[PDB]
Amino acid sequence: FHSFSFYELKNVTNNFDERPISVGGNKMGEGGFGVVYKGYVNNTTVAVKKLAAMVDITTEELKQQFDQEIKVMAKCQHENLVELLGFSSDLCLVYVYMPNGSLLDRLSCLDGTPPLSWHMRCKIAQGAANGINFLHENHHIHRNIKSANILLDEAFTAKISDFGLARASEKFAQTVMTSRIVGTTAYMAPEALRGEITPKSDIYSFGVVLLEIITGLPAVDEHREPQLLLDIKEEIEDEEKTIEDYIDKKMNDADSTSVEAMYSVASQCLHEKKNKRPDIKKVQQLLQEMT
Numbered sequence: 001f002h003s004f005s006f007y008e009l010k011n012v013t014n015n016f017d018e019r020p021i022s023v024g025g026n027k028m029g030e031g032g033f034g035v036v037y038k039g040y041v042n043n044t045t046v047a048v049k050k051l052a053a054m055v056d057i058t059t060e061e062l063k064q065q066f067d068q069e070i071k072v073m074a075k076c077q078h079e080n081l082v083e084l085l086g087f088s089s090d091l092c093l094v095y096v097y098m099p100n101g102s103l104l105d106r107l108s109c110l111d112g113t114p115p116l117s118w119h120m121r122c123k124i125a126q127g128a129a130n131g132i133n134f135l136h137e138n139h140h141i142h143r144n145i146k147s148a149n150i151l152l153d154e155a156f157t158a159k160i161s162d163f164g165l166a167r168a169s170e171k172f173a174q175t176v177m178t179s180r181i182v183g184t185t186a187y188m189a190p191e192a193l194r195g196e197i198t199p200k201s202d203i204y205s206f207g208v209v210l211l212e213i214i215t216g217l218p219a220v221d222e223h224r225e226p227q228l229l230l231d232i233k234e235e236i237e238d239e240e241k242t243i244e245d246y247i248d249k250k251m252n253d254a255d256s257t258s259v260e261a262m263y264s265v266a267s268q269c270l271h272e273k274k275n276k277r278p279d280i281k282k283v284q285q286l287l288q289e290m291t
Ligand SMILES: CC[C@@H]1[C@H](F)C(=O)N[C@@H]1COc1nccc2cc(C(N)=O)c(OC)cc12
Pocket: 028, 029, 030, 031, 032, 033, 034, 035, 036, 046, 047, 049, 082, 095, 096, 097, 098, 099, 101, 102, 105, 148, 149, 151, 161, 162
């Protein structure tokens, strides 16, 4: 990886211009642990993520995720993984530019982009599953699978991002002692919330992403019934509603059999008991057969 000086990263991002792209600024996105800026360097467009405490998190904790991202990215290069180009040590990571942003942005139709077709959503789901299969074959657990961590290039190819929490070893990691767990709780499996590290947790989180794809709704919304998206599984199983009641209205090309087929996959991924979920290879097979 290339070691960029901090000052030249400041230059190429128009002095880290935090105005949106619309008004001629460089801000592309924001999360709990940083802001992502569009940059121009070496006759190319790049993305620069500058780490910062936007939510409650310490400097030492951010430095750990910075070092972990670089260690994992050095071992993991794949069609369905975002490519790290370099770094600078504030702490900056530099990536290949993804012009179609995150899956979350595109499902919300941010900045008046047109809705994703059913067929495009199926191909993105397949791409993301192939990304997770690479990681699991190479004995990695992502630990932060969500629509904001699925990026889209010129061809709408799915690229998994954010490897700051990724681990190379399985753990039970539960005692009567107080502990600190990091993650996005709206996407997290029961055993993941309690602190267990297993690839079976990545399957559950993928299940939540499949529901976002079907419904076009965010994983959590305070001003909604239900607030958690994964709760609709019970609503449908109790025959109180159907999947048809939750399908994204903005889709016109979603045949019932194909949508029913994807919900069944999502339902299996969202089993409370981790041993009762399909493995990633079974998820790949099922997605391929219905598309
Ligand atoms: C701090 C924000 C977090 C974190 F960055 C992440 O992995 N997911 C979140 C959203 O991030 C992004 N949102 C919109 C657009 C984004 C374009 C790029 C890009 N390479 O062009 C990007 O690269 C990494 C991240 C982008």
